[PDB]
């Protein structure tokens, strides 16, 4: 029975919720496990960026957020085409590709392709055979200047 | 203090392990300090107890400089029996008194092939530790 003034409340506890309760006591252990896996993966891929491949510059969909820009899933096929990168080589050199994304505005297209050119100018390519380099990069360029990068690759700034 | 995350400090767990310890490590548990002369002759401090070595009791009712040879290492009771460390019961006969080996000092070691090898390993490890410390 209600008594005097007060909100009319509808608690959703009519359904035996005690059997399904998620307790978060393993939250710090989960954080440590995630951190350890992060460190192990970064250790495994030594010169490559730890965070992952470069993601494209992408505008947010709806009218609430379209003024804002975030990171996308991968660079579009057209962006790769006009950047001069084969779509089967971009992923190996560390570029996320999003085949199912089409471009609608040349402004966003140009932003992404300038990003791709900038990444290609920032890339250090180890030769496949360490003894015999074909066209990769310079010995002085990679003897010490190639080191692991933390955080997003060329981060997106509003 | 203790930092190994795989080594317990629980009193109950430690007592369970101690009282349920297998015989081959009950031997290690039943270890006794060497005398000063033995601790000088060999660069080792303690030594697990054996059937036929001669000790002297340092604590309890039977203290004294008398050198008595062990005659029994009763590992289930975690005691040893010594030659003249005995006690006479009511009917006239006599038995031995259980004594924890930690309450005696070994004065002479029953040397054979194995004891010398154990002494060698312990002395080598002590030398390694002190030379790292220097």
């Amino acid at each position: 029975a209600p008594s005097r003034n007060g909100m009319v409340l509808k608690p959703h506890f009519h359904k035996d919720w005690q059997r399904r309760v998620a307790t978060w006591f393993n939250q710090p252990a989960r954080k440590i496990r995630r951190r350890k896996a992060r460190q192990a993966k970064a250790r495994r891929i030594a010169p490559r960026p730890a965070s992952g491949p470069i993601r494209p510059i992408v505008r947010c969909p709806t009218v609430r957020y379209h003024t804002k820009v975030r990171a996308g899933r991968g660079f579009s096929l057209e962006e790769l085409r006009v950047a001069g990168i084969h779509k089967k080589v971009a992923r190996t050199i560390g570029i996320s590709v999003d085949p199912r994304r089409r471009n609608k505005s040349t402004e966003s297209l140009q932003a992404n392709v300038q990003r791709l050119k900038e990444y290609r100018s920032k890339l250090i390519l180890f030769p496949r055979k360490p003894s015999a380099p074909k066209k990769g990069d310079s010995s002085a360029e990679e003897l010490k200047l190639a080191t692991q990068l933390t955080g997003p690759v060329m981060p997106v700034r509003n | 203090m203790k930092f190994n995350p795989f080594v317990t400090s629980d009193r109950s767990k430690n007592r369970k392990r101690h009282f349920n310890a297998p015989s081959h490590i009950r031997r290690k548990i039943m270890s006794s300090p060497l005398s000063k002369e033995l601790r000088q002759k060999y660069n080792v401090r303690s030594m697990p107890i054996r059937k036929d070595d001669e000790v002297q009791v340092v604590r309890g009712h039977y203290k004294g400089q008398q050198i008595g040879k062990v005659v029994q290492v009763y590992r289930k009771k975690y005691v040893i029996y010594i030659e003249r460390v005995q006690r006479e019961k009511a009917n006239g006969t006599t038995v031995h008194v259980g004594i924890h080996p930690s309450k005696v000092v070994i004065t002479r070691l029953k040397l054979d092939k194995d004891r010398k090898k154990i002494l060698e390993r312990k002395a080598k490890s002590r030398q390694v530790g002190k030379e790292k410390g220097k």
Partner: protein, 263 residues
């Protein structure tokens, strides 16, 4: 408690026409357990009233500004000899209460030289008090691995760890604390401020970056300035005896008028 406790039984009530209480009783026969009560908080073997459960909200979240406020208050309190002596930290021959030493102690490796440092800083009586206070805890904590208890010694605060942790850490009561990761649970031991602290010089210099002055803000924190006072001059006796107050008062009425007998 185990959610199954007190309920692993098929007991049902006997009824009402059998001259016994209506609490559920275990079925079956041929044993002591059959017919005994069950399922009640009053019954031997029944589950407790309101079995405590793991979803009890053990953790509390405190405002970050309040946490920094507490750290500032503890740091300020450690600098008052009345408060630290009130904690009983044996600071009698300490040359100066905000005790700061050179960074050479950060390079200490041996407990021998750490102890010699304490002895030359006249803090060894604190450790002696800790040694004299080691004893056995009263109660079930002995069964629950908290067998031995002792007092809190001084707190060593360091900027860079160059083995100073290993040099210390075999001294009972010594708590080693990085200056950029200060802990209120160690600065105020039992909820009462005033713990004796020994600062390395680099850690002492870093305090104006960690918590800032009032003229500047803290730089090593994104946004924090030191809390403001609500009372600058706290010397109440001096204030009351100031002439400006004394001229505005009326004279004291110091004659006690007791009850007068009605003759």
């Amino acid at each position: 408690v185990s959610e199954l406790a007190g309920h692993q039984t098929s007991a049902e009530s006997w009824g009402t026409g059998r001259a016994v209480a209506r609490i559920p009783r275990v079925r079956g026969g041929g044993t002591h357990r059959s017919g005994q009560g069950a399922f009640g908080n009053m019954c031997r073997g029944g589950r407790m009233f309101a079995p405590t459960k793991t979803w009890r909200r053990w953790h509390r979240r405190v405002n970050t500004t309040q946490k920094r406020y507490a750290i500032c208050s503890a740091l300020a309190a450690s600098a008052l000899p009345a408060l630290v002596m009130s904690k009983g930290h044996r600071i009698e021959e300490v040359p100066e209460l905000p005790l700061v030493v050179e960074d050479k102690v950060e390079g200490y490796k041996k407990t021998k030289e750490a102890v010699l440092l304490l002895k030359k800083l006249k803090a060894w009586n604190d450790i002696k008090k800790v040694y004299a206070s080691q004893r056995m805890r009263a109660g079930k904590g002995k069964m629950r691995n908290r067998r031995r208890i002792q007092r809190r010694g001084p707190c060593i605060i360091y900027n860079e760890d160059n083995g100073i942790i290993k040099a210390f850490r075999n001294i009972p009561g010594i708590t080693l604390l990085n200056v950029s990761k200060l802990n209120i649970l160690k600065l105020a031991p039992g909820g009462h401020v005033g713990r004796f602290c020994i600062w390395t010089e680099s850690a002492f210099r870093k305090l104006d970056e960690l918590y800032g002055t009032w003229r500047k803000a803290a730089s090593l924190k994104s946004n924090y300035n030191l809390p403001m006072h609500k009372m600058i001059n706290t010397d109440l006796s001096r204030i009351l005896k100031s002439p400006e107050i004394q001229r505005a008062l009326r004279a004291p009425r110091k004659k006690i008028h007791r009850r007068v007998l009605k003759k």
